[PDB]
Each structure stands twice: as structure tokens, then as C-alpha cells.
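quick one, two chains, predict together pls
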Amino acid sequence: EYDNAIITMMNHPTDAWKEGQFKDIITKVANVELYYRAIQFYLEFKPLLLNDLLMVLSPRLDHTRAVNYFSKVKQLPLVKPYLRSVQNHNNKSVNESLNNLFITEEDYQALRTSIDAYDNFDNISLAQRLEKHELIEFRRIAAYLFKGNNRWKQSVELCKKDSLYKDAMQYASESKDTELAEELLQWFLQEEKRECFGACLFTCYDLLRPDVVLETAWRHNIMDFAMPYFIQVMKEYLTKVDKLDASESLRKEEEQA
Amino acid sequence: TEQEWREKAKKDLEEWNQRQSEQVEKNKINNRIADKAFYQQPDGTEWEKVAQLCDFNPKSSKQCKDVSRLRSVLMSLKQT
């Protein structure tokens, strides 16, 4: 009667069809395309009553063709709860679908959290979209996925493009690598955003040698936000020579024995 | 009645699309005013500017080279 049930449900779209009755015999149905026929016939007549089948058709499901056909009908925003159900799997298809949901959604926060939780995608196209997505935050995440893609110097370079309002510094921080900040920071000095250049240099201070700093300070005859960095230089150097004198004393005293 | 059911499916689709477009417009104008905020900014009064244009961040993440003087400059010179 199970086959008879699916027949008498589907056979008569004119007078004999029913949405709910199908949720029980599914347990012993071997194929999966039968549930696809069910959900398709439902979309044809009652697309609002899909959520039930979605809740019930959870364990046994070929979600690939499911989301494919959902994109076909373009009821992806309607199958959205099913998407929340299955996105925990971090699959290429479900991830890209949610990413398009965020793109057309113009959402970034939840998009951020999603691309953090799930990663089954590339960075290139995502950067392309976010960089042109009208928000400094969108292109900011486009840049974030560069280190997400492990290719720096383009992200903070984009901060150099547009997000200069301390956001250039915001990614100068994460840049965390040498032999760039010298010339980048000098170019930064070309324009008079140097006003906070003490921070602009400190945000990546780890591996700076103050000699070029003194040089360029001389080149513009510039001392502000450097006089502070000069105090830095000498005080680190102060501490350095101090610990050196200490260690030396220890060594010369222990040499006797 | 397959025809009326298809009609109601199209009706639900249109009722969904109109609210989609409405919410896109809503978040769009939200991003517009947020960008205006992103467009309302410059790029003692010198300290007022080292705070206003690009303010540093005196966090607990100074593990680089034990830079302390930032403790003082925030009150001695910078933003003073």
C-alpha cells in the first residue's frame, strides 16, 4: 500500500493529492528520488508546507541535488531553514549557497561568522565580491580573507587604497611582517597623515631599526611622533645596555672560579 | 485545482520577493548612512588630532618589545 499510497497521492493532482500523509511511509523507501518527487510536487502546489518534510527528511538525504533543485526553483530563501539545518556540514554547495545568500543579503556580520565556521570555498571570487560590496566592512573582509588565503601585502595594500582612516594602520598591525612597512610607511609620510605616524610605525614596531627612522626624520627635518619614538629607542636601548652591564658583571665575577 | 495552486505559489513567490526587495533597500540605506559615517572624519589641538584622525590603541597586546613609554605619552604628550 506504500507504493499505492504514493501513487494515490501523486496520481491525481486534480482531485486526490495530500501534503502531510507522505511523512510516514518514507522510512522504508529505498530510493531518495521519491522524496525529491514529493518535495517538487509540493513546491508545485504547496511550497509553504515544505518545512515539515525538511524536518522529517533530515537523516536520509542527498543534500547535493536537494540544494541544486532549490536553486533551480530559486526558493533558496524559502528552503533557508533547511539550509540552517544542513550548513553544519561545511560542504562546497551549501557554503557557496549561503555565501550568495549573504551577497544578495548584503550581510557581513553573520557572513563573517559563517565563513569563520565554514571554509569549503576559495578566496579569490569572495574577495572580488566583497571588495566591491559598498561597505568598508565588506571590502575589509575581502582583505581579511587574504591572510585567510595567506597572501598579505594586498589586503593592507587595499587599506592603503581606501581604508586609510586608521584602517590602513588597522591592517598594518596584522601585516606582522618586515621589509614592507619601511617603504609603505614612507609613502604614508608622503601625504601628511603622518600626524599619527608614531602609532603608524608602532602598530608594526616589532622589527624596526631606528637608524632609517633617524635618517627620514632628518630628510623632512621631522621630529614629532619621532621624539616619542626617539624616547622609545633610547629607553629600550637604556634597558638593553643596563641588562648588558649586569650580565657582564655576572660573567666577570664568575670567571674567577 | 492545479491552476489555482500554481497561482497561489506565484502569489507566495511575489509576496516573498517584495519583502526581499524591501529588506535589501532597508539594509542598503543602513549601509548608506553607515558610509556617511565612514565619510565624516578627517581623512592640545595636536593631541586632539592624534586622537581624532588616527587614534592609537593602548591595549594589552604590547608584547612586541616591552614598550612602556606609551603609558606616559598618552598622558605626557600624545592625546594630552
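Chain B touches chain A at residues 1-2, 5-6, 9, 12-13, 16, 20, 24, 27-28, 31, 34-35, 38, 41-43, 46, 49-50, 53-57, 64-70, 73, 77-78 (CB under 8 Å).
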